[PDB]
Amino acid sequence: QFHTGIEIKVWAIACFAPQRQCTEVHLKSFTEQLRKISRDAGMPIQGQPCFCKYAQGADSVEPMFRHLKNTYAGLQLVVVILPGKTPVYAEVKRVGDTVLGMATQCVQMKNVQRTTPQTLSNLCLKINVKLGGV
Ligand SMILES: O=C(O)CCc1cccc(-c2ncnc3c2ncn3[C@@H]2O[C@H](COP(=O)(O)O)[C@@H](O)[C@H]2O)c1
Secondary structure, three states: OOOOOOOEOOEEEEEOOOOOOOOHHHHHHHHHHHHHHHHHOOOOEOOOOOEEEEOOOHHHHHHHHHHHHHHOOOOOEEEEEEOOOOOHHHHHHHHHHHHOOOOEEEEEOHHHHOOOHHHHHHHHHHHHHHHOOO
């Protein structure tokens, strides 16, 4: 079930959670915790995303994903932080899967604000399934 040989060197964060709820330090904390667990599991995600920006609303998804595709050669993944149930999820999947062919992984804001080994493990397993056997 689990894939070896994944190395995620070029990846982006698109934060659809409001900055006042999911701060720069929450993003840095979450990213560092994800770096360490993904590494321990032999699917290392490098500590520094090439891009980390806030956006709001489903209409921002296509412009930002077009920008990412146009700017970052060898981009392997966009981690999308969502604030609860939101039409932004459907739009991220429409643009990523059907328009631009860009791998995306969505995560709940509450799991970025406060991490646990179990929820970082849940996320690594979803990423592994996506980026494994390409
Ligand atoms: O339009 C509306 O009013 C709400 C629409 C709606 C209906 C059903 C589900 C959603 C939805 N909203 C936000 N996050 C969602 C979601 N469905 C799944 N997710 C998130 O995406 C993650 C899965 O990400 P990937 O599909 O990239 O593996 C789930 O863990 C969960 O964290 C949104």
